[PDB]
């Protein structure tokens, strides 16, 4: 299949963040991509990475990145909503691939709500509930 160059760049950005811990680098690289109508894909891929990870480090790191991106006006409400809704749609299959993903997703969504970055409506739409 042909390369989706932008998916590749978003995955590289997220992996570089998880490996380096450098939130500012991640933010700057996202802005340099200049893809504000594909920020739903950043959100989607970031949450999939949390679901696929082990231990707590990726969960916290991705939480902190999404917190900063929302709070800095880098992701619009529509893009944020669509990223989470895309995860909510695909979670049955993600959960088959990675058991107990419903519970990880629910914890992640609750922590995002506790951080002020998603509406109560969007939290409540999580199918784990």
Q: How was this structure determined?
A: X-ray
- Using CA atoms, how far apart are residues 120 and 117, in angstroms rounded to an integer? 10
Nearest CA to 85 among 121, 32, 31, 49?
121
CATH number for the domain harbouring residue 102: 1.25.40.180
State the sign of the Cα–Cα–Cα–Cα dihedral 71, 90, 126, 77: positive
Residue 92, Cα to own-chain centre: how many angstroms?
17
Q: Yes or no: say if 75 and 43 are a contact pair by the CB < 8 Å rule.
A: yes
Residue 27, Cα to own-chain centre: how many angstroms?
13
- Count of other CB atoms within 10 angstroms of residue 62: 25
C-alpha angle 59-88-58 in degrees, rounded to nearest 5: 10
Q: Name residue, tokens 């914890």.
A: 107
Q: Name residue, tokens 């619009």.
A: 76
Domain boundaries, position 113: 1-129
Return the axis-axis angle of helices 39-52 and 57-71, rounded to nearest 10°.
Answer: 160
Q: Is 37 exposed, middle or buried (0-12, 13-18, 19+ CB in 10 A)?
A: exposed
C-alpha gyration radius of the chain: 14
Give the resolution value in Å: 1.1
**Number of domains making up the chain:** 1
């Amino acid at each position: 299949q042909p390369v989706n160059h932008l998916v590749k760049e978003i995955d590289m950005l997220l992996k570089e963040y998880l490996l380096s811990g450098d939130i500012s680098e991640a933010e700057h690289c996202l802005k340099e991509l200049e893809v504000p109508h594909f920020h739903h894909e950043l959100v989607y891929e970031a949450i999939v990475m949390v679901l696929e990870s082990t231990g707590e480090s990726a969960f916290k790191m991705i939480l902190d990145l999404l917190k900063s991106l929302w709070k800095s006006s880098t992701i619009t409400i529509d893009q944020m909503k669509r990223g989470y809704e895309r995860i909510y749609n695909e979670i049955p299959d993600i959960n088959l691939d990675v058991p107990h993903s419903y519970s990880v997703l629910e914890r992640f969504v609750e922590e995002c709500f506790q951080a002020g970055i998603i509406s109560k409506q969007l939290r409540d739409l999580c199918p784990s509930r």
